[PDB]
């Protein structure tokens, strides 16, 4: 049942980025909400999409 097979694997690391917004957020009240502009477009759209 054990079959030797080449499995695709990531050859690099993921990244966590701090936005222009998000640095001012972490300065302002010492927290980050991840994916902020992807929240804010939902804000100016209908909210919970």
């Amino acid at each position: 049942s054990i079959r030797r097979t080449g499995v695709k694997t990531p050859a690099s690391y993921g990244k966590f980025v701090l936005s222009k917004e998000n640095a001012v957020t972490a300065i302002a009240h010492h927290a980050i909400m991840a994916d902020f502009s992807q929240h804010a477009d939902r804000i100016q759209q209908s909210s919970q999409k």
Binding site: F16, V17, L18, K20, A23, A26, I27
Partner: protein, 49 residues
């Protein structure tokens, strides 16, 4: 730099430059101060003069 270092570094730069800039201000105003105080210590009053 994932950009949160960059504000901190440029604020270190701004703090050092504003320190030297207000330092030159303090040097000029202290020159004003001690020049005025030397004129006070070398100026007799009008009822003497």
């Amino acid at each position: 730099d994932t950009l949160l270092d960059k504000l901190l570094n440029a604020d270190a730069v701004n703090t050092v430059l504003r320190a030297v800039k207000n330092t030159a201000d303090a040097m000029e105003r202290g020159l004003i101060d001690t020049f005025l105080r030397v004129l006070l210590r070398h100026a007799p009053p009008c009822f003497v003069l």
